[PDB]
Every structure is written in C-alpha cells, then in structure tokens.
Amino acid sequence: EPAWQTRDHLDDPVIGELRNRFGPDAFTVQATRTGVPVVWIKREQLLEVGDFLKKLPKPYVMLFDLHGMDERLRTHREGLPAADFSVFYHLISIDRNRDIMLKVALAENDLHVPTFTKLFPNANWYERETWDLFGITFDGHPNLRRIMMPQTWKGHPLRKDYPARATEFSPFELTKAKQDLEMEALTFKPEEWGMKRDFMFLNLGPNHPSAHGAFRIVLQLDGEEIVDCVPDIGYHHRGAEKMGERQSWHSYIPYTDRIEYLGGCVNEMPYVLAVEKLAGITVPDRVNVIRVMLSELFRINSHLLYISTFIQDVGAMTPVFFAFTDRQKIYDLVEAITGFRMHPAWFRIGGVAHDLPRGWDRLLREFLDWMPKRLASYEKAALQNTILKGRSQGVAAYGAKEALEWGTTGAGLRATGIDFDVRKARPYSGYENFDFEIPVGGGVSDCYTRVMLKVEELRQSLRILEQCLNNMPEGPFKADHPLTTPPPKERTLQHIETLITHFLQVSWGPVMPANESFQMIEATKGINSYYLTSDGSTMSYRTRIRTPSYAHLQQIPAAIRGSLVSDLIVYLGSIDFVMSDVDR
Amino acid sequence: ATIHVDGKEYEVNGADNLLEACLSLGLDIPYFCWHPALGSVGACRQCAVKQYQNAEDTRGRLVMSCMTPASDGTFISIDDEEAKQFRESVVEWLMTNHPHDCPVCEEGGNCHLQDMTVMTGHSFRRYRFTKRTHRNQDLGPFISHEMNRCIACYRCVRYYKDYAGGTDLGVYGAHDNVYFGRPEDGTLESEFSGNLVEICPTGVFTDKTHSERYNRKWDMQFAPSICQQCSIGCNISPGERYGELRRIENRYNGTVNHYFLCDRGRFGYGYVNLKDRPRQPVQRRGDDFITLNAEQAMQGAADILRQSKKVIGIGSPRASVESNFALRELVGEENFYTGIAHGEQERLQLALKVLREGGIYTPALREIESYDAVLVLGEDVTQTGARVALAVRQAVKGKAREMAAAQKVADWQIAAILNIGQRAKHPLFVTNVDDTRLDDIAAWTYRAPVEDQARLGFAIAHALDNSAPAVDGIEPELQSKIDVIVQALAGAKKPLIISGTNAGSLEVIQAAANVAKALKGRGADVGITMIARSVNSMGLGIMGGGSLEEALTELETGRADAVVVLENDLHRHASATRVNAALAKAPLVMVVDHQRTAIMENAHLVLSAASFAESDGTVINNEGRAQRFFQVYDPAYYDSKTVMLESWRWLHSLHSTLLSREVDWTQLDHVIDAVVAKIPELAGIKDAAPDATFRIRGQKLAREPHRYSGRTAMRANISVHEPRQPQDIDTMFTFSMEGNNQPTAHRSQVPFAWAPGWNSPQAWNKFQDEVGGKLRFGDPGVRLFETSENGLDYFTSVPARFQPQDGKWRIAPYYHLFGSDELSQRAPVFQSRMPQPYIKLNPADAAKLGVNAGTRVSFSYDGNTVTLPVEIAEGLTAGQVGLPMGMSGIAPVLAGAHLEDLKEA
Amino acid sequence: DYTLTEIVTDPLNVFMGKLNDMVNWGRKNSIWPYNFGLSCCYVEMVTSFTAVHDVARFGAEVLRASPRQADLMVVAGTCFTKMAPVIQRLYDQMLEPKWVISMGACANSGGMYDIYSVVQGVDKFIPVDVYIPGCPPRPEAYMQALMLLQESIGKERRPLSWVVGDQGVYRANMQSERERKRGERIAVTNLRTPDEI
Numbered sequence A: 001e002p003a004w005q006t007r008d009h010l011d012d013p014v015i016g017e018l019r020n021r022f023g024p025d026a027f028t029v030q031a032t033r034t035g036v037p038v039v040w041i042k043r044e045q046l047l048e049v050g051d052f053l054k055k056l057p058k059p060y061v062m063l064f065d066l067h068g069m070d071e072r073l074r075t076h077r078e079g080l081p082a083a084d085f086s087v088f089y090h091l092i093s094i095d096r097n098r099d100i101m102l103k104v105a106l107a108e109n110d111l112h113v114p115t116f117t118k119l120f121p122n123a124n125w126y127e128r129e130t131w132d133l134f135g136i137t138f139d140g141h142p143n144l145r146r147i148m149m150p151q152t153w154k155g156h157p158l159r160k161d162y163p164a165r166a167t168e169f170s171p172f173e174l175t176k177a178k179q180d181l182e183m184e185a186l187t188f189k190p191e192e193w194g195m196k197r198d199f200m201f202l203n204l205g206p207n208h209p210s211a212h213g214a215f216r217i218v219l220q221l222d223g224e225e226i227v228d229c230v231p232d233i234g235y236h237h238r239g240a241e242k243m244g245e246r247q248s249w250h251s252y253i254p255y256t257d258r259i260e261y262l263g264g265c266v267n268e269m270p271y272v273l274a275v276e277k278l279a280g281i282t283v284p285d286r287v288n289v290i291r292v293m294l295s296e297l298f299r300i301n302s303h304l305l306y307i308s309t310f311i312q313d314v315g316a317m318t319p320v321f322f323a324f325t326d327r328q329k330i331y332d333l334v335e336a337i338t339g340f341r342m343h344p345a346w347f348r349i350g351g352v353a354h355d356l357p358r359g360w361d362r363l364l365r366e367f368l369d370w371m372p373k374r375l376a377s378y379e380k381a382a383l384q385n386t387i388l389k390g391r392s393q394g395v396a397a398y399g400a401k402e403a404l405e406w407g408t409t410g411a412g413l414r415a416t417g418i419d420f421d422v423r424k425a426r427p428y429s430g431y432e433n434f435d436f437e438i439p440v441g442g443g444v445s446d447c448y449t450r451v452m453l454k455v456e457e458l459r460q461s462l463r464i465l466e467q468c469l470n471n472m473p474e475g476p477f478k479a480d481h482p483l484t485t486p487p488p489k490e491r492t493l494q495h496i497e498t499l500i501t502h503f504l505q506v507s508w509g510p511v512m513p514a515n516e517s518f519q520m521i522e523a524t525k526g527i528n529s530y531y532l533t534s535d536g537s538t539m540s541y542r543t544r545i546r547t548p549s550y551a552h553l554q555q556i557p558a559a560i561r562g563s564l565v566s567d568l569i570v571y572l573g574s575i576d577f578v579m580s581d582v583d584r
Numbered sequence B: 001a002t003i004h005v006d007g008k009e010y011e012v013n014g015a016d017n018l019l020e021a022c023l024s025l026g027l028d029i030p031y032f033c034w035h036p037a038l039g040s041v042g043a044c045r046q047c048a049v050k051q052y053q054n055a056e057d058t059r060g061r062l063v064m065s066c067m068t069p070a071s072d073g074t075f076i077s078i079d080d081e082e083a084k085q086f087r088e089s090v091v092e093w094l095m096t097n098h099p100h101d102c103p104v105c106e107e108g109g110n111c112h113l114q115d116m117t118v119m120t121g122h123s124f125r126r127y128r129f130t131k132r133t134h135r136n137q138d139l140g141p142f143i144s145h146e147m148n149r150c151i152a153c154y155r156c157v158r159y160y161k162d163y164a165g166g167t168d169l170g171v172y173g174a175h176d177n178v179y180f181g182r183p184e185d186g187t188l189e190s191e192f193s194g195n196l197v198e199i200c201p202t203g204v205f206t207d208k209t210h211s212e213r214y215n216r217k218w219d220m221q222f223a224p225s226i227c228q229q230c231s232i233g234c235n236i237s238p239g240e241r242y243g244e245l246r247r248i249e250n251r252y253n254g255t256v257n258h259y260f261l262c263d264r265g266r267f268g269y270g271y272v273n274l275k276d277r278p279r280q281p282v283q284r285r286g287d288d289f290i291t292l293n294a295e296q297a298m299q300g301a302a303d304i305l306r307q308s309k310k311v312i313g314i315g316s317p318r319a320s321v322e323s324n325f326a327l328r329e330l331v332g333e334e335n336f337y338t339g340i341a342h343g344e345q346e347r348l349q350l351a352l353k354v355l356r357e358g359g360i361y362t363p364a365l366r367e368i369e370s371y372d373a374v375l376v377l378g379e380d381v382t383q384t385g386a387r388v389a390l391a392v393r394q395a396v397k398g399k400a401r402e403m404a405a406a407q408k409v410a411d412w413q414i415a416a417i418l419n420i421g422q423r424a425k426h427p428l429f430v431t432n433v434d435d436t437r438l439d440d441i442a443a444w445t446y447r448a449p450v451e452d453q454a455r456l457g458f459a460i461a462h463a464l465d466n467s468a469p470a471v472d473g474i475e476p477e478l479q480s481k482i483d484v485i486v487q488a489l490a491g492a493k494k495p496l497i498i499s500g501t502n503a504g505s506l507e508v509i510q511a512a513a514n515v516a517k518a519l520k521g522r523g524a525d526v527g528i529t530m531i532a533r534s535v536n537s538m539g540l541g542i543m544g545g546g547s548l549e550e551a552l553t554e555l556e557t558g559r560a561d562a563v564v565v566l567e568n569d570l571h572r573h574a575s576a577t578r579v580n581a582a583l584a585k586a587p588l589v590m591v592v593d594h595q596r597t598a599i600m601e602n603a604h605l606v607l608s609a610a611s612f613a614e615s616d617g618t619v620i621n622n623e624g625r626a627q628r629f630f631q632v633y634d635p636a637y638y639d640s641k642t643v644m645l646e647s648w649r650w651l652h653s654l655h656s657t658l659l660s661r662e663v664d665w666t667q668l669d670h671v672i673d674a675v676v677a678k679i680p681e682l683a684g685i686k687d688a689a690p691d692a693t694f695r696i697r698g699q700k701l702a703r704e705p706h707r708y709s710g711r712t713a714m715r716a717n718i719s720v721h722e723p724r725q726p727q728d729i730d731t732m733f734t735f736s737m738e739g740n741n742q743p744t745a746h747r748s749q750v751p752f753a754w755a756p757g758w759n760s761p762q763a764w765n766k767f768q769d770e771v772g773g774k775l776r777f778g779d780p781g782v783r784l785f786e787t788s789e790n791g792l793d794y795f796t797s798v799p800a801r802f803q804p805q806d807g808k809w810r811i812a813p814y815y816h817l818f819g820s821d822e823l824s825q826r827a828p829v830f831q832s833r834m835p836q837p838y839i840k841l842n843p844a845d846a847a848k849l850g851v852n853a854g855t856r857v858s859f860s861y862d863g864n865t866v867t868l869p870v871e872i873a874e875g876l877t878a879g880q881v882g883l884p885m886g887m888s889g890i891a892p893v894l895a896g897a898h899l900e901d902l903k904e905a
Numbered sequence C: 001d002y003t004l005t006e007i008v009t010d011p012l013n014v015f016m017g018k019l020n021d022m023v024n025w026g027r028k029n030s031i032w033p034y035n036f037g038l039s040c041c042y043v044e045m046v047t048s049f050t051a052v053h054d055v056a057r058f059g060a061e062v063l064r065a066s067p068r069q070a071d072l073m074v075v076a077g078t079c080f081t082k083m084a085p086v087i088q089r090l091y092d093q094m095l096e097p098k099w100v101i102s103m104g105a106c107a108n109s110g111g112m113y114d115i116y117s118v119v120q121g122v123d124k125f126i127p128v129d130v131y132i133p134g135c136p137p138r139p140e141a142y143m144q145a146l147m148l149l150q151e152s153i154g155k156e157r158r159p160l161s162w163v164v165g166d167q168g169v170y171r172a173n174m175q176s177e178r179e180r181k182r183g184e185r186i187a188v189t190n191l192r193t194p195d196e197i
C-alpha cells in the first residue's frame, strides 16, 4: 500500500470516538487521498462535534483551515452527501499528530452555517473569506464583512458561475474609488470595522515602505497605547485559487511559485506532492533529494531576507547589504540549476524539469564555505546588540495556548515550546533520510526568540545541504509513471509513444482521475498546504491554498493589544509574512 | 440484462455488445475498430476485457468486448491486470510502426490513437527496429492521404463500402503491408467521402481544406449550427480561428444526421472566408461608394424609405425565419414576396400541404433507415438531399439485417449480417430523367421525363387502390414493372415514398402523395419525405407571400418604388434580363446580403449582412423541424471596422428607425417572440433552443475549449492592449471558455464534443445517454406540425405522356452535389471538384443535329444565346435536353422549361 | 520627431540649448525613486539597491518614502484593483518632472494574472516611460531600464522657467530597442548547451 492510496481511515480512533458519541448514522466517512479522515457532518451537529473534538483526551487544538467549495459542477460525487456547496474544517491534534477534515453540506438557497469563532478564534478571517468568495453566511459571526474584495463588490468570485477573467477597465470606477479613499478618513465609522467606543484613530497604510508588502492597519490609540486594531487586507489579492480552477495541472506550477515569493520551490513542493498523490506517482529517491536541496536553499534565502528585514526594521542598515550578497550567492546556484532566480517553476509532476547541471556541486561547496562566517558576523554585529535586544525582547509575546488557538505555525509555534515541524512529525519528500534538529523556544514567543529560531533553522538547513552534498544519489530526475508531466525530453524527441504522451500532456493537460488529495509542508514562514479536488479533468476542480501568513496576521490584534506602535512595527518585522501569502 | 463490471452491478440492454454497453455506463474501454454505426468486426483487439463464468471464478478469459454480447448475469472486469497489460500491448504493437509525426500531423489534439495511447498508460518504447513506410495517394481536393499513420483498424473500408456504398476505396496487400486507399490516384467518388476524416481514428484521412489553414482543436471557437447547403438540416459544428471559418465538424443529432454529413456540407463552407464579401454598409452616390457605419446607414435608409410611396420586400429561402419575418414586418405582409418563382412556390406549397395535411407521418432522417421499401419519384436525392440517399442505403440493407435477426444473430455482428444477407436487399425503385447514384442498389430505375414519372406514380397508386385515378396508355412491359413495384410496396411493413420540389413538376409530388395515400388506405405504416431546395425553403413556404414574378411586375409597373432584397441574388429564381430591368427601373434598391451578388451593381444601398457563421437564427428543414443555429464568432473582434450584423437585426433596426426615427439593435428572443405571436404556424420555433437567459447552474455555454490559447497575443499585432470580450446578448453561448461544456449538462445544444481523455470525435459517446443513440436530455430541434388525423384527396390531374415536339426542347435537370448550391459554388475548393458544364443530349437527338460528343452548341433562352459542349446521355429520353442546374448561367428555374434554337455553334 | 504634451520636430538660441542640456544632465544623473512595494518585482528592485549590484553608482539610491521628493515611480508589482487608486494618488502627489517605469509583466500588462482582481497593466491609468519584461526582471534589467530612462530624459525638452518660454513638454520618439538590437540578436548562431554550468 503506497502513500497515495485511497484510504477511508476508519481505523483512526477519532472515527470510533465520534461513532460512540454521536451514533453511527450521524456522519458519513469519505475515502480520499488526502491522508486524513474526511467526515461529512450534519450542519446542526457541527458545533457539538467541534466541541467534542476540542474536549478529547488528546484534543484537536488547532483549526488548521476553514473554507468553502462550490460543488454544483462536480460530476463524480459518488458516496458523497448531496451538496450545492460545502464548508470544510481542517483540525489538527498535535498530541495525536493527527488531523481530521469535517465537511458540512449546504443547499443552494440555504447558504448559512453556525459560526466556529467560539470554539476557535481564528475562524473569523476564514469565515469572512468564505462569505466573501462563496456567499456562505455564518450565523453568529461578529462582523461578517468582505476581506479580499472591497465592500462595494457584487458577486462571489470563487463560485463556479463567476467569470474568472479581468473585467474591462474603466476610469469611472477608478475615480469613484479614489473619491472613496479620499472621503474614507472624513466619514470613518468604527462600527462597520468591528471596533467599539481621547481615543485617537489612525491609518498605518495602505502603502508601506517595507519589503513585506503594502497593507493598511486601522489603529485605535490611547496616547501611545494600542487599544484595538483591525487589519485591512486583500490589497494583494491575485485570485490564485480561481486560477487553479483555470489552468491545467502542469501549467499551474508558475502560479504556485508566486504564492509567497520568497519561497519559490518551497511553494512548488506541496502542490506537486498533492498532484502526485492524485496521479499515483511515487517519485524516486534522487527526485526527493533534489527537491529537498532546492527547498533548503530557498529556505536559507528566505530566512536571510527575514533576518535582514528585521534588523533593518530595528534600525541597523548594513547587514541587509551583506545578506543580500549571500542571497546573490544562493541565486547563483539556483540560476545554474533551474535557470531562474526567485520563481524557478522547476518542480514537475513526477520530478523536476531538468537534471542537475554538471558543476553544481562546486557552487554548493562555495556557498557552504561562504555562509557560516557571514552568519556569525551578522549575529555578533546586530543580533547580540543590546539596543536590538531592547527593541525586540518582550515585544508581542504569547504562549502555547495563544499560538494553538490562532493557528500560528512555524517559528512562533516552536518559540512557544511546541515541537511541531512538518518535516519531522509528518515527513515528506524523503526528509527522514536527513539528520537535522528542530530548534524550539523556552515557551514564550518574543520577536527576538522568533528571530534566533530562524537563525538556528538557517544553520540546520546548512547542515541539510552539507549532508545532501556529501551523499548525492545517482538516478533519474523524473519518475517512470505514465502521468509524469512532461515526459523525459530525449525520449519525447525520439519515441512516438513518449511524443504522444508529451503532446497530450502539454496541450490538453494531464488527466488526473477524480479524487481529493492534500499535502502539508513546513514552508519558510510556517505550514503551507495544498488541498486539491480533481473532478476527473485536466484542470483542478478546487485548489485551496492554506498559508501561514493569514493566520499570523489574524493573530496580530490578540498579541499587540496594549502595546506601542514601534512595538507593532517590530512585531510586523518579526512575523515573517508577505502580503501575497496573506491574500494569494 | 444484468452485468457485473469490476464487482459493480449494472443494468444494461441485452441486445447490445459489451463495449457499447460499458461505454454507455461511462466506463472507459479503449477501442479502435468498433464504431456505433458500423458494428463490430473484432479486428484491432483493443477492447479486451476479462470475462468470468460466474461470480466465484478467478481465472477468467480475455474476450473482445465489442464482440461479446451483454447477456444477463455477465461477469467481467476491465481493470484486471491481465486485460490492462494486453490492451497496453495492443497499443504498443500499433506504436511500433507509427511515424514520429504528431507535431506535423493534422489529427494532433483530435486523435483517437493519441487518446488511447495515453489511456492505456503506454509511454515507454522498447522497440528498437525499423518502422514500415508507405507512399501516399492523391484522393482529390478534399481528403489528404497519409498511409504511414494507419493502424489497420479497417474502419475506412467498412464505412466507405459497407455503409456508404462507395466502390473506389479498399484494402490491398497482406500481412503487415495492408494499404487502405484507391487502386490508383484519383478523387474519391463517394458523396460521403468526407466522413472518413472522422471515421479514421488516426491521421491517414484528413480534411485538406482545413489542412490549408490548419489550427488545432483546442484553438477553435465552435458553435452549434445548421448546415445551410440544402434542406436536410444536418447539425454541424463550425469552428473558426483568427476571424475566418476554419472547419466544419459533424455535430451529433441522434434524430437527424447522427455521425455523418455529406461532402457539400462538410467542404462547401469556403464562401464565408471570401475577401469580396460586404463587411461595411456601402451607399451609392453617383459613381461613389461611400462606406457608412451602422447608425448613418440606418438613418439614410429609413429616410429614403420614408419618402418612398410603397416598399416591397423580397425574401429568400437562404435567409432565416427571423430575417424573413423582419423583412415582412418592415415592408408589410401584403408587400412581402417570397423570392422564388411561381412554379417553385407552387411546388413548395404543395409539398408543405402534403407534409402537414396529408395525414401521413414524415420521418426524420435517422428514422428513414428503418423502412422496408423505398420509392423515390423524380428526386435525385444523392445530388440534392444526399444524407437521405445514405439513409435509404441503410434502409435497403435492413433486409439483410432482418434475415440475420431471423437466425438469432445479434445486430452488432455486422460481418455475419452481411454474410447472411449476400445480395438480398429491400426493394428500391428510383425514377429520374437519367441514371442516379442509387442505381447500384435500386431494385428498379426508371429513366423517363417528369410527366412519365408522374404517370408511373399515378399508375402505382391506382393499382394499389382502385379509388385512385387510372392512367391510360401504359405499355405492357411497363405495366409488368408497375405490378412488380405494387407487390413490392404492398408487401412492405413500412413503405416510404420520397419526392421533392427539385424535379420541377407538380404532378410528381401529386403522384407521390397519391401513392402514399393508397398505401395509407391499405393499413401500411407508410411514410412520406419531401426534399426541398434550400436550407429554409419550408420556412419560407410556411411564412408565405407572393412569388418573385409578382414582385417583378410590381417593380416594372411603378407601383413599388423601393425594393429591399434579403439574401437573394434574384438570378436563380428569374431571368437575369428581366430582373436587371426591374431593378434598374426601381429608384431604390436595398440589398441586405453577405455575398457579393450581381445585383449590388445597381443597388442604391448594400447592407453587409452576416452569414450563418456570424449570425443566429432559425431554419426549418425538409421534414418541418425548427432548428436554431448560433453565431460562431464576432466579425468585429479582429477587424474592428467591420460592421456585419444579423439580417433580422438590420431589418428590425430599419423598421424602428422608419417608425420612431431611432435605431433599435434588438435581441434574438424578441424577434422569436414576434414570430410566435404573429405567425401561429411557426409557434414551435420558440422551443428549438432556450433563450439567452438559459444557464447551466448559473453559467453560460462555452464556445471554445478550456485550453484555448494565445488570448493575449492573437490581436497583439494590432494593439498590445487586449480588446473587450465580445458580449453575446442574443444567445446562451459566450465568446469565451468561461462557460459549460460538460457532457452531463442539462442541455441539447452542444457546440463541440470534448471529455478528458477523449479528444477525438469519439467524445460524442460521452455526450450520449447510450452510444449511437440520442443526445442526452434530447436532441435539439422540434417538429413544427404533427401528423393530421385526416388526409387529402386523390389528385385526379393525371398528366399526359411526354410528346417530343420539334423546335421545343424540354430541359431535364441535372443536379450536382458540387455546383447546384449557390454558396457552395462560391467556395473556392469546389471549383476543382465541380465538373465542366456539359449539355446532355440523347444519341438520337445528337444524330439528328449531327453534333458529336464534345462539340459546342449554342441555345437561346430569354434572349440569351449561351454555348455548352455536348455530352451524350444514353439514359435520357429523346425530345429532352439535359442541363446542369445551379451552374454558371443555368438557373434552377429551367426545370420543366422549354427551349428554342438549339443549334451547333 | 518628437511628442508635445502631437508629433512635432525638435524645437531646439544656442545658449538655451546648452542650458536645456545642463538641466537634462542634472535630471538624468540625479533620479530619486519612490519607495513603493507591490509584489516580488519590488524585492528584485531593492536587491538592485543593495551592495552586490549598487544602484547608488548611477545616483539613484535615495529611496524616498514621500512622493513629493521622488522623481521616478517604479510600478514594480501587480496593479491590484484595491491598490490602483493608491497608485494613482501617489502618482498624482508627485511633482514635475516625473517618470514612470513599469517593472515586470504584471505592471506591463497584468502578466499571468488576467484575473478579476487585477488591472491589466499600469498604463491603463498612468503614463509609462520605460517597460521592463520579466517575472521578475533581474536587478541588472532594472539598471538597464534606468539607463534607458536616462537616455530618454537626456533628449527631452522642458521649460526652464514657468514664467518664460514655451511650457510644453517635448518627449523624444526614441527608436525601439527591439529594432536597435535586431542586428546583433538575429546574428546569434550557437549558445552554450544547458547541461553545463
């Protein structure tokens, strides 16, 4: 039984617990390739099912994901409950190292679900996005307003009947929105924004002079203290999931590159692993090693960017220049291998686009000799500076409970002391064959603690690169599956069967058989996951992308309340987010 | 019957074989040599499944599912490892000799062999030896031949010979050097040779006309349209790219034209792409041609119409129901004239009266293949209604089908059916002025003038029923042949009588109605078919109006000073001299047309109408079925200065500007509702297609496939800024991929067939409820009239015998599939296929004039001395002269017309 | 061959020509870009600002957070529908003379994001002086665009004073770089095989 085999997960103890608590007819178990138990729950039992999972002996403490799906055009729904729409809730039990998806069916006219914000406070933005993109009402939600589109938007873009392409540009709408932005400060009402109540009101954005994007924060201030703050996001919404419904399985890889643009192949990895789950492809070991190589190189690139950005936000200006020289070394190696700098689009369904070019090990050895002295110099020049420590330590701290209840993953969760890395807990792409440690914090997630954890993660990625350089397998760079897209180029250029497979795979698209798959990886900023629904066609029926920056930005008001604005700037600099990852 | 496929129970029909039963259930079995219309022969060995004797069986046995009946309690497995490995091995064996040709092959992206190579999962080549090659033949102007790509599936020979009745295509050679083609280079003789491009699962037979301006299937913009080249109304999928019509694919209609077109419909689309078509409205001012936009053309036309004292409208059978109705509304009902001759209109009205008042059911084109005896009276169906000739061939082979069914042989085992039915066939009696293309299978062929064919029909009706009027002057051997026809028709369970208006004789239609009434009175399940001339001839006949001669006298007498001619060249329905004189006398001529005709030289205004590829509308076919054709592309998308609108849009806006001095570019559904309200006989055309508000779960129907390419570069040479997507307010389709083309969508209008893993024309199997049956959720199109309870009376007007009078010469019509239809003549690829115009003469008459075969003689009709070279026709009757109709100068109104001054040039 | 804001000829005493040349020299040798981060193209822009590329050598490192002090707007990123009024307002807040560089396929035409929430190019609502293809353009492509902008600035005519002379802005119609480099680009025969480094 391979890892991609369709499982029902009836042997999971959570299924037995749900059967013993709610009865055998209260829910329907769906067999998928997602690797998790998928359980269709009735809508009226959703809150008690969530409470029961929250009160388990080893409970499901984190709401990993919450989003909708338009199932009106889905043809292969055999064994599934009748649903015009559905809402899925992905919950993670860290103690069990398990996860469960709960799906609620909804009719076309009765598009309302009970809110999940009481059980999980991070459900607020997910329900706002599900209402925004699907029109699904959440009863009991405090402020069910649009979060990606502007408030004066008609329709719900992720529905199947919504036209995906760009509308014709009009100067009238631009002028009207400019007038709206001009009179926004004059007619600001702090009731539609979810706020309440010498209380100054300020706008931080929308333009921001930094490298993580441009987004607006509405601040309520008592002098310097922050009483309340809500973020205005969706300014960088590219419609990547809707493009998932519009590209083929192969031609969507460059779009997966630009989800978070500091990651590249790290962003390509969960998508291609989920497509390989849909295709039934077990990639060879050299493919796993190459993909791990590129993921760790881009992880070092992203962490160097993050440390430099944090140091520059504190006020030291030189280490960003030095670490951009280090990024240039990494980019030299990545340019040699993939042909591009930051959006390589080099991962393929079944492997990688090309073999490693002859001479890559020299560039890897040069970078591995270059990096550690520079990292020690960065530490001793800026990270051990007492002014930086005073600006960083004790700023926007939270414990493990706040990280769990808000879906915070990555360096913040491990800085709260929770040892939960995807590469160790739920290994993927042959990460079990590499010896590396997972740095953890003492139990409190400061800005400084997160930054030093990212430094230790950079050192561990350097160790992974060392082991990969000393032990490189020889073999194929693509799998020998009929659904390896595209096939190897030389066989395409001189064999007619391979030419036929290449012809149909690049033009109409590879045919993924009707199934659902899911891949979760430890990205550069947290846990990045792809949830893929195939309706048997050459395009994705649904492409749900869970990104960690969304969860961190939703955690922002619960951790910075009662602090200053400079502390807010430092907290923004130490979160490791990009706005493309937030909005996607 | 009950089958168990991979452990799952299924309820199927026991008369089908296993492959078609499993394809009807959505299961994917690869197959090459089987076709839903051709039967099973078990050649390619691709459809192999594993059959078990019972539920508790583990070994099983490989069987061909196309040759295995779907009997009750049949246990099989498709996903068995042995069956999968054998199907992969069959694909691999086919792949050993296949050329490395997919990038430079016209079947790429539309290839069944590509789809089944991918479907079997075979992508690694372990064959290292040489591949066999073949020379290619020249098959004419339509079909391109590439013998290297063949997989020896024998579909071409089975279709072309056993189905189409063609003789010149065959299989030659031996063991692995099997060749499929003609014995020598030359044009494929069959009128249905074009369906080889969809029958062949590989790139051997390709559309050469498409291969000129080739584009891949994912790059096409498709629409569900109706073929406009005769009255049968076959469902087509025109596909375009870069503003020009690229291809005509067959569109599956299980009630009309299921898998097959004829070559005139498939290849005679080249008139749409002509560079001399009107693309802007042009106004005449002295000798100047001023190009107008839509608004100022409408304003000037309506002003000049308002100053006129009486405006008449001349419709055409080429135009749609909506455009003819819009002209009728613009000029008034009493001023509307059908643009056909008085004799043509009389024959059309009589055919319509027989169809919707004779009390005899008129079959659809698919239903013709189930009749037990066929009598064709005066209609050269192979040249005028070719798909009816194909269905008549199927009905003729029905006797072999019945003989095989008497021996408990299944209907899909075609080889056994043809073996049992060696040469026994159902009775076919065709009458014409000469030999027809159905003579190879006809039980009898009667070569006679139209009066003698009508007298034969009246004699058959009298011998079947003595209440019918009798015929005096029948020869004894002709009486014996009449008796043979009578005992053949009386013994038939389902006799079928076919006639039409192309014979040029009212008495032929009257005699056919008399035969059908006589068979109806005996209790037989008789059907009657009438072949009209043009695409909307029945619609123009139902609409009614005056003849073209009445309009010409109205123009000549000065009672009408303004004439609006809609999609009519006026030369095919009247003499050119009289038409030119009447149009020169009229102070205002406004020609709304999409083809450069000869009457726009004297026209004051020319409105650049849209053809069928650029317009929506409704057409009524020869059996009275309303069918909606949809616009394929917007002509203003690539050339932004093109003002090319629907004809009904032009005329409705002209009426609105004439009334309220304001343009009104209306919607299609408004004109449809106006037709339904004003004309109750056309009330069925509302149900031909749903309106523009029709959605599939809230979204429109897509015109182009999902992988449509180059959307930010096709117009980048004009401007780098992407243009606005053309909005479609008339119909439920969209000019984009943003829509639905799912095979399980609740609709009947399907623009093109594509399912994932099925890029070939075999995706129509996915678009049907059962393969080879009807479209799922019904076939598009609605019959306008039901069968009447009471029929007509016997037509007592029995004509006399044909008397050859000296000086006079009766014109016998000789129709050609490539050359009798006007727009098909305009297609440049038909100019090579169409023959040189030969005037047909009897040997006795040619000896009387002393002219030999090939010499030129000159004859004068309506003061027009034209010369033609003589071809000797032995089957022609003396006193008649044969003329090719529709050709250069030979209008189709010469059928039954007398001739003077036949002399050698 | 110029453009007045109409195709006119070159309007250029000989002292006024020298003064205009000095003004154009000072303008092109001191270009202050506005610090505006939209998407990944901004990351490559600020990569060009760093030590390994050193865009300071061209005098274009003074990255302003205020549009008043900035001369050059580099639209480097996707022009989202919510961000487009912000871009238009920040462009309007700038002062004459002002120049615009579209960086990347998103800012050029919308790029791969022909989607409901993206404006298809920033030339839909602001005038662009230099376009850079790429997704992202590499930092030296941004440097090359800066030299293209400098060459365009050096041959444009602007009023020396707002009280004396013609106040119209005459921008030169440069030869396209495609037509200029077509001589050397077509003549390329062999490139290095991709299997090497």
Ligand SMILES: CCCCCCCCCCC1=C(C)C(=O)C(OC)=C(OC)C1=O
Pocket (backbone or CB within 6 Å): A317, C046, C049, C050, C056, C061, C062, C063
């Ligand atoms: C009114 C206050 C003015 C403060 C000084 C502004 C002008 C100097 C900017 C220096 C600078 C900073 C901070 C900087 O962060 C940066 O990186 C993007 C540069 O480019 C290399 C710079 O040149």
Ligand code: SF4
Pocket (backbone or CB within 6 Å): A500, B098, B099, B100, B101, B102, B105, B106, B107, B108, B109, B111, B112, B113, B114, B149, B201, B202, B203, B204
């Ligand atoms: S017939 Fe099909 S498999 Fe053969 S070369 Fe053409 S596209 Fe390829």
Ligand code: SF4
Pocket (backbone or CB within 6 Å): B149, B150, B151, B152, B153, B154, B155, B156, B157, B180, B199, B200, B201, B202, B204, B205
């Ligand atoms: S030419 Fe085409 S249809 Fe004929 S046997 Fe070969 S592959 Fe089959």
Ligand code: SF4
Pocket (backbone or CB within 6 Å): B227, B228, B229, B230, B231, B232, B233, B234, B257, B261, B262, B263, B264, B265, B266, B384, B385, B386, B387, B388
């Ligand atoms: S039979 Fe008539 S309607 Fe059918 S394809 Fe031929 S010309 Fe067209």
Ligand code: SF4
Pocket (backbone or CB within 6 Å): A258, A261, C039, C040, C041, C042, C076, C077, C078, C103, C104, C105, C106, C107, C111, C134, C135, C136, C137
């Ligand atoms: S062009 Fe490419 S790199 Fe630049 S902003 Fe767009 S997605 Fe990012």
Ligand code: FES
Pocket (backbone or CB within 6 Å): B019, B030, B031, B032, B033, B034, B041, B042, B043, B044, B045, B046, B047, B048, B064, B065, B066, B067
């Ligand atoms: S399809 Fe059955 S053997 Fe060919």
Ligand SMILES: [Ca+2]
Pocket (backbone or CB within 6 Å): B615, B616, B631, B728, B730, B731
């Ligand atoms: Ca239209």
